Amino acid sequence: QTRTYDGDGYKKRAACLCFRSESEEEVLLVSSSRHPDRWIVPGGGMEPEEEPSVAAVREVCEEAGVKGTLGRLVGIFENQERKHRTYVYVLIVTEVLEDWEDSVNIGRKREWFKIEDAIKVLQYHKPVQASYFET
Ligand SMILES: O=P(O)(O)O[C@H]1[C@@H](OP(=O)(O)O)[C@H](OP(=O)(O)O)[C@@H](OP(=O)(O)OP(=O)(O)O)[C@H](OP(=O)(O)O)[C@H]1OP(=O)(O)O
Ligand SMILES: [Cl-]
Ligand SMILES: [Cl-]
Ligand SMILES: [F-]
Ligand SMILES: [Mg+2]
Ligand SMILES: [Mg+2]
Ligand SMILES: [Mg+2]
């Protein structure tokens, strides 16, 4: 409910690569709120004084309805066009919840993708999110 910003005015965000297992072969994407036929990596704005790892796990619970074991920070990713900067973490999913905030509120969808297929569906509208998987 309060947006936060880095010193250069980029919006602060956090997200997780929500993998099905420690193999990191399949990842959970969620539907775009604006365009539900498109896929995105779940994530969102850091609240004031919120640790990035805490914001990442919170936004994944809100948007994707999953919980799990937080892993490494992958990196910090800027979107120059939209002026935001996202901390991206690995999350190993251990709990899949049936009727989560965004399912109830906006009918948000979620789906498992093989990594190669996640990169494919993100490339057109979300190429920075496709890059999250590069390394
Ligand atoms: O105007 P669009 O439809 O492009 O909306 C974008 C975005 O605009 P941008 O590119 O100007 O930053 C929203 O920002 P805000 O308007 O809340 O600041 C962003 O929220 P966010 O950063 O994730 O923040 P949280 O709400 O999750 O904390 C939202 O994601 P959803 O959460 O998924 O609804 C995106 O939608 P899409 O990616 O299609 O699903
Ligand atoms: Cl996996
Ligand atoms: Cl992006
Ligand atoms: F949000
Ligand atoms: Mg959100
Ligand atoms: Mg969001
Ligand atoms: Mg939010």
**Burial (Cβ within 10 Å: 0-12, 13-18, ≥19) of residue 85:** middle
- Resolution (angstroms) equals 1.5
Strand boundaries in 7-127, DSSP class E: 11-19, 26-31, 39-40, 43-45, 66-79, 84-96, 110-114
Of 17, 12, 7, residue with least CA distance to 52: 12
Say which of 24, 47, 62, 78 is annotated catalytic. 62
Is 20 annotated among the ligand-binding residues? no
> What is the C-alpha separation between 63 and 40, in angstroms, rounded?
11
Is 114 annotated among the ligand-binding residues? no
Kindly list the domain boundaries of the chain, sorted by start residue.
Answer: 2-135
Domain 2-135, CATH:
3.90.79.10
- Amino acid making up residue 74: V
